[PDB]
């Protein structure tokens, strides 16, 4: 099973307990963005992350009681639309607005049972992917898919390291590829042991296909309430990009000296075959277009590694 | 019967009937339609060898100053990005794509890619989260059924084609539209199934191989490459790979008679065969520029991969 959350009075974490932490259900988020839930029906609002405020420039308690369609006129039917009522909860739809306070904000939502939840984070406004989806394509071997993957993934976005990781099957995973700025240790070859990321991580990973930690040494933001009023039960975020990381996995990049970290799932035969994982020794906060971007590499990755492992076997 | 390749028209080759239609060699055109211009180019020196009739118009320049110009000269930013990206040896699939801003002819899309030692140069016009959202839907569509429904309509909305279609080949390369998404008033093609040879099996190869064709006029004449055949080897110059490529005048003339101005279809490969195809049709002669096209082209991979998925869930 699970063990509850802290915040329910649950276990501290140990590498004793790796697989039992609820990572799903943190009840707070990372504070590059801000993050609401609200009901499906009435579109009223009934969570939101103590950071609201800056990202929405709203007085607190004008949120917590206002409707989407107020708040929201445009999306609030595209969205019940979108999403409606008995959808998964992998799917998402999202939007730009253009927000009196702030610029430009991606709004990104998804639906569990009778919640949407709603993220925003700062956004703005060529060629690349389509001459990468073409490379990937045309790599002669999954060897120098890996190397081609990885490289591309690079020059996107800018991380100081990029790696294929491949789950063998017993869940060891190994570095099959590798690319990098100069002067980093080198990753490649290595295979680390499965509880590096525990099972109740590579389930959730199958489902909802990329995650990231912005900054390894920010504080999580909580969500208030924390408890969901419809359930008086945790809210499931493990379809919200913007929920907080686990302290375990922030203490495991800290301590290889990782500022901000990615990574997108490869899933092939409906199981997790590996990872576009991403390294930056610094804080990084990937912008979501550049982001969408990487998912779409992850789906075409996922096909031609079936295509090239099949021209082996 | 499978019968090798004709020779083309223009090396003295038969004129194309019913009878032999497996036979007429439709990579090899000579010529190109006519909404966008076709260079050649040597891949090592980057002498410009065969340019298609109109390409003054699209470039703005004498033939004889286009020709007696290497592209390190004609295209200085975009000339080493093309050999880096376009290696000695590579496949003719891969292709390379940039947009330039010419002085005559606007923003012009650059496309690229290599046949042994040629580089062919298509020069074309160019111009929120609807990709994005596509695939999320795709992905959560429940059965093959609701995936080539939303995929119809989501294709039929990005684009406003009058009438797209999911054309699904049986295993004898009858075919059969199992989905589509249309204009009101024209009359539905669901269900129905066409003959094997309607897509004969030089076409079916080459649709294996590169993913995307298209007929943008169906009445408009095709444009001659000047000269016809590559100085290199005298001998034909393979267009397979170039969107630009004339469509055979026998199918022109299979889309003429259905009544439409305008064709485009985007491979489905599944396991290393033609699976299907997303067919679209417009009544109206009707260009799609290349970055709309590319949306077509992601989502054809996307439905390749939800197609296996799919159909994996069933047994
Ligand atoms: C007690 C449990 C422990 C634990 C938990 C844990 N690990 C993850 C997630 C990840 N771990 C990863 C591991 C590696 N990254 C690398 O670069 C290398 C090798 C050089 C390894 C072995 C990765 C890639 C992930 C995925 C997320 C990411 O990209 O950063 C989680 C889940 C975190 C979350 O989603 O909130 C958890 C709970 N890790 C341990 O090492 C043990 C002690
Ligand atoms: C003597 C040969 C004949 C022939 C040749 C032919 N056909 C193609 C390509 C296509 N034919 C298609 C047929 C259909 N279009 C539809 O909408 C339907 C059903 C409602 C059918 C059966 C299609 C879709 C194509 C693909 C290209 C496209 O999307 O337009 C070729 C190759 C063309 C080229 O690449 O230049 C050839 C030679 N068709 C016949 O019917 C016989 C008379």
Redesign the pocket.
């Known amino acids: 099973p699970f063990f509850p959350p802290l915040y329910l009075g649950g276990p501290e974490?140990?590498?004793e307990?790796?697989e039992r932490?609820p990572?799903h259900i943190?009840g707070s988020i990372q504070p590059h963005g801000a993050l609401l839930t609200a009901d499906g029906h009435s579109g009223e609002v009934l969570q939101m992350s103590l950071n609201a405020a800056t990202f929405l420039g709203q007085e607190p308690t004008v949120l917590r009681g206002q409707t989407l369609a107020a708040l929201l006129p445009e999306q609030w039917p595209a969205l019940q639309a979108a999403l409606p009522p008995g959808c998964p909860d992998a799917l998402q739809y999202r939007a730009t607005l253009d927000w009196p306070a702030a610029g430009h904000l991606s709004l990104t939502v998804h639906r569990v049972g009778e919640l949407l939840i709603l993220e925003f984070e700062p956004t703005e406004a060529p060629h690349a992917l389509r001459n990468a989806m073409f490379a990937l394509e045309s790599a002669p071997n999954l060897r120098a898919l890996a190397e081609v993957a990885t490289q591309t993934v690079r020059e996107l976005t800018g991380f100081d390291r990029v790696?294929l990781?491949k789950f063998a099957p017993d869940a060891t995973?190994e570095?099959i590829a590798e690319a990098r700025r100069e002067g980093l240790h080198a990753?490649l070859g290595?295979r680390?042991p499965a509880?590096?990321?525990?099972a109740?991580?590579r389930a959730?990973?199958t489902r909802h296909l990329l995650?990231?930690?912005a900054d390894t040494r920010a504080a999580a933001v909580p969500l208030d309430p924390v408890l969901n009023p419809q359930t008086n039960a945790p809210t499931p975020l493990g379809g919200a990009v913007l929920?907080?990381?686990?302290p375990?996995?922030m203490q495991?990049?800290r301590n290889?000296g990782?500022g901000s970290?990615?990574?997108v799932s490869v899933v092939v035969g409906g199981q997790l075959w590996g990872?576009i994982?991403?390294?930056h020794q610094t804080p990084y906060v990937l912008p979501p277009d550049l982001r969408t971007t990487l998912e779409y590499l992850g789906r075409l990755l996922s096909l031609q590694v079936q295509v090239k492992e099949a021209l082996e076997h």
């Open positions: 974490i140990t590498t307990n790796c932490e990572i943190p790696m990781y995973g570095v990753f290595h680390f509880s590096d990321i525990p109740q991580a959730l990973y995650r990231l930690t929920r907080a990381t686990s375990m996995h495991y990049l290889m990782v970290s990615l990574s990872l994982a991403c390294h």
